[PDB]
Amino acid sequence: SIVGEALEYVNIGLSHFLALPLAQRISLIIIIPFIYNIVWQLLYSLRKDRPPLVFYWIPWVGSAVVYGMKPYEFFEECQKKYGDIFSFVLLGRVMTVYLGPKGHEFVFNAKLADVSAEAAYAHLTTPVFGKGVIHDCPNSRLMEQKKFVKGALTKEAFKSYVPLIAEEVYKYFRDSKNFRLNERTTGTIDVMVTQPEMTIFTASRSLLGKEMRAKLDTDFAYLYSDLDKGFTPINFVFPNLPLEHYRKRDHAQKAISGTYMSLIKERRKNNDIQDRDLIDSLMKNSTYKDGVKMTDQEIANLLIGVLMGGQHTSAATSAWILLHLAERPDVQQELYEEQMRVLDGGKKELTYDLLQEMPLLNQTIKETLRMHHPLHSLFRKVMKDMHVPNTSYVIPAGYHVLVSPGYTHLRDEYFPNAHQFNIHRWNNDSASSYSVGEEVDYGFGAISKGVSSPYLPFGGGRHRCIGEHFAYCQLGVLMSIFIRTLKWHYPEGKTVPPPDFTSMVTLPTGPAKIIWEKRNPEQKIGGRH
Ligand SMILES: CC[C@@H](C)n1ncn(-c2ccc(N3CCN(c4ccc(OC[C@H]5CO[C@](Cn6cncn6)(c6ccc(Cl)cc6Cl)O5)cc4)CC3)cc2)c1=O
Ligand code: HEM
């Protein structure tokens, strides 16, 4: 009646194991985690208190490759097999996806104690922006930082930004190799080259001021390029690794934040603090509610973050607008007529107020943001176990929740013929967004309380975007001028490119070229160059 001899043969087996040929021991260190992985998923599939988990062959990697290459195609397959809630493994992490408007509610209105955005995002952005701001600080600091920035983003600021943004667009048509409208009447451009330059020029001039704008004409512009490089999904797994890419980024962040602090300390020294730009504004208005002031280093890091966020979402969006309009001369024609009616055939300077009298222009932005949400996946790390309403599912702490309003933007159920670009689906509804009812303030102004809208380009809840009006202002001036100045179309046989879902924003797969030509070949842009 001896089990003792079994326990001996366990120990013997462990010892015979350790003495295997190194060819078999490498094999086992591969085959036994592979076998265990399959065994674990099958067992996992039994738990009725967990959403279904998408099956995967490679441990740790998970569904990373198919999710990254074509996330909306991934989501649609999963939705057919499992419905709206399902999980998948992604480079070590378990992501729980909740598709559709209830998904929006579940994640964007999640209680602050249940989930954390900074725990999800901190590695992605802190290396790039610097310490102390955005996701490298507690939520209540973030709430107030959004309040400070929003304070420079008022109707009266937009009124003064508009002629500044217009000036930069015109100087870019005049001076850029891509255009030179005083010398050339037609030409070819890559919109992934032109739009990121146009966006940084206009955002700099209006948010940072003319000094910082002036510096973009120098070799300082190269540091922006270097810091721009460090803004990549790979920071999610490799935020820091001793290589040259990471070294230029860190240098750039120091060099750029140094330049902003130089200006800040310069302005405080001369008492030269007005209401020109966002720098003036944060100098006057960056004291937290427990009395602590933001440092000059933190103020500068915040400027980098604001500028970098606006840079990528807006540049991609104007690239998409150009690309969709290039095959739709009917829409270009209709926008041109609205410009002629609102601006008296051009005998009226563009103002922020007149921009609000251009519904078709704003509907074009709205519709581009529907087809091309710059951020396909928004994340939160789960901090406490969460019950999913009307289900038996519990999402345990340590999981991530993923919400994807850009996926819902492309469903026929909520947008008839969702794959078709149509600015007229927004007729009599051209506002960037609006709360369908009740509102709430998390620290940075009253916003919509419900987040169930199928259309959520700026998200919702406490992490809701605050740059929506600035983006529309910027994109509006830009497109108003393109339309009044140029017609454009595709090279023969070219059409809208598919999105690049592996970058930070869903920008077009390039080279994405359009051919432009002047509406008025003899028109000249004045000023010195
Ligand atoms: C390894 C194999 C390969 C095939 N693969 N396998 C998987 N993937 C992959 C997966 C996921 C993703 N991403 C794309 C980027 N994405 C993402 C990027 C930025 C982001 O930002 C959310 C927060 C933080 O940044 C901002 C962005 N922003 C918002 N408005 C303007 N910018 C932000 C907020 C505030 C401020 Cl001040 C700045 C910034 Cl940047 O909001 C959220 C998600 C996550 C998924 C990419 C590739 C791959 O490429
Ligand atoms: C087309 C332009 C833009 C789009 C579509 C967009 C979209 C978004 C979205 C979806 C979020 C929420 C992210 C999340 O919930 O995880 C967000 C957050 C945010 N965005 Fe934007 N954005 C745009 C432009 C801008 C601009 C121009 C600025 C700055 C002026 C800006 C600043 C911010 C800030 C400060 C947050 C808050 C992040 C947080 O609270 O955690 N965005 N944006």
**Cβ atoms 351, 162 nearer than 8 A:** yes
DSSP structural state of residue 234: G
* CA–CA dist 192, 508 (Å, integer): 8
Cβ of 378 less than 6 Å from ligand 2: yes
Name the E strands within 343-449.
378-382, 386-387, 394-395, 400-403, 439-441, 446-448
**Cβ atoms 506, 372 nearer than 8 A:** yes
**How many CA atoms within 13 Å lie on the side-chain side of 432?**
16
Omega cis (within 30) before 233:
no
Query: Angle at CA 375, nearest 5°, toward 369 and 381?
Result: 145
The closest of 7, 104, 65 to 405, measured between CA atoms, is: 104
- Where does 19-55 have alpha helices with state H? 22-44
* CA–CA dist 112, 462 (Å, integer): 9
The closest of 224, 213, 215, 219 to 164, measured between CA atoms, is: 213
> For residue 306, which atom of ligand 2 is closest to its CA?
29
Residue nearest to atom 34 of ligand 2 (CA): 465
* CA–CA dist 431, 418 (Å, integer): 19
> For residue 67, which atom of ligand 1 is closest to its CA?
7
Name the E strands within 50-103.
85-90, 93-98
The helix or strand, by DSSP H or E, that contains position 304, with its residue range, turns out to be: helix 296-326
Cα of 155 to ligand 1 centre, how many Å? 29
* CA–CA dist 425, 370 (Å, integer): 11
Q: In sequence order, what are the residues at sequence separation of 6 or more whose Cβ sits closer than 8 angstroms to the Cβ of residue 259?
A: 212, 215, 220
- Angle, to 10 degrees, between the axis of helix 296-326 and the axis of helix 244-269? 120
Cβ of 405 less than 6 Å from ligand 2: no
> For residue 133, which atom of ligand 1 is closest to its CA?
37
Residue nearest to atom 35 of ligand 1 (CA): 309
* CA–CA dist 129, 301 (Å, integer): 5
Cα distance from N-terminal residue to C-terminal residue, the chain? 100
Cα of 5 to ligand 2 centre, how many Å? 66
Residue nearest to atom 17 of ligand 1 (CA): 504
Report which bound ligand comes closest to the CA of 139: 2
Cβ of 306 less than 6 Å from ligand 2: yes
Structure tokens at 365: 């932005």
**Cβ atoms 78, 88 nearer than 8 A:** yes
**Domains of the chain, start order:** 48-529 (1.10.630.10)
Cβ of 305 less than 6 Å from ligand 1: yes
Which of 125, 129, 148, 505 should be mutated for ligand 1, with most atoms under 8 A from CB? Answer: 125
Provide the 10 A C-beta neighbour count for residue 67.
24
* CA–CA dist 510, 497 (Å, integer): 7
Cα of 391 to ligand 1 centre, how many Å? 29
For residue 448, give the amino acid letter: S
* CA–CA dist 180, 174 (Å, integer): 5
SS3 at position 457: coil
* CA–CA dist 209, 266 (Å, integer): 14
> For residue 233, which atom of ligand 1 is closest to its CA?
46
For residue 59, give the amino acid letter: P
**Cβ atoms 127, 482 nearer than 8 A:** no
- Phi, psi at residue 189, to the nearest 5°? -130, 160
392: exposed, middle or buried (Cβ count in 10 Å: 0-12, 13-18, 19+): exposed
The closest of 448, 459, 309 to 376, measured between CA atoms, is: 459
**Cβ atoms 257, 296 nearer than 8 A:** no
**Cβ atoms 280, 274 nearer than 8 A:** yes
CB under 8 A, 24+ apart: contacts of 240-244 = 240/127
> For residue 461, which atom of ligand 2 is closest to its CA?
15
Provide the 10 A C-beta neighbour count for residue 252.
22
Chain mean position to CA 4: 63
**Cβ atoms 497, 508 nearer than 8 A:** yes
